[PDB]
Amino acid sequence: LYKKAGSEFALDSSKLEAIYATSEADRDYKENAVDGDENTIWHSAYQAADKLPVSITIKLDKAYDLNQIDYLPRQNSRNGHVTEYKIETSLDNENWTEVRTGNLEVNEAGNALANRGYNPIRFNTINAQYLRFTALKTLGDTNNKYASAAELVFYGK
Numbered sequence: 001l002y003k004k005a006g007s008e009f010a011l012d013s014s015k016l017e018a019i020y021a022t023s024e025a026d027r028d029y030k031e032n033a034v035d036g037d038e039n040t041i042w043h044s045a046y047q048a049a050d051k052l053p054v055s056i057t058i059k060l061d062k063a064y065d066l067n068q069i070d071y072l073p074r075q076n077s078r079n080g081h082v083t084e085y086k087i088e089t090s091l092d093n094e095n096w097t098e099v100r101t102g103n104l105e106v107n108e109a110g111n112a113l114a115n116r117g118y119n120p121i122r123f124n125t126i127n128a129q130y131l132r133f134t135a136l137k138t139l140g141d142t143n144n145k146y147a148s149a150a151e152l153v154f155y156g157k
């Protein structure tokens with residue numbers, strides 16, 4: 001029911017730009033969520049007053065008909081693994097449509113995502129030049145405080 005990385009629709013990460021994120025920590029910048037690279041992450045701040053939700057806004061080079069993104073969790077650590085999320089889109093970065101909400105399954109222990117590769121998230125084909133991805137629940141040494149993402153893969157025409 002999903003599509004894999006070899007969909008004719010998989011936008012190239014060169015098409016994407018992270019224009020905004022609630023916060024960023026260390027050297028884990030918003031740009032690392034859409035650089036096509038498993039080995040870089042976006043991580044949000046984890047100071048004392050930092051809590052969820054956090055979100056990141058991806059700008060596309062034109063407006064696309066999107067119907068799926070893949071979420072690639074941080075490969076070396078479960079810190080910031082997103083387990084509940086929200087997806088919104090817009091043409092103008094001011095008026096958002098709420099596309100959907102949802103969860104990703106945890107492993108047996110409950111300490112990391114069950115699927116450590118591309119977790120596909122499909123939705124009904126909507127036209128967009130901006131997508132806001134919002135982490136609602138997350139894992140980490142402290143749960144539900146900070147989020148990370150290794151990649152967001154977009155699909156659309």
Ligand SMILES: CC(=O)N[C@@H]1[C@@H](O)[C@@H](O)[C@@H](CO)O[C@H]1O
Pocket residue numbers: 026043046077079080140141142146
């Ligand atoms: C190298 C590394 O893992 N750094 C993490 C950091 O990204 C963040 O998750 C922080 C919050 O607890 O924990 C650190 O250990």
Ligand SMILES: [Ca+2]
Pocket residue numbers: 032033034035036037038039040041042149150151
């Ligand atoms: Ca990356």
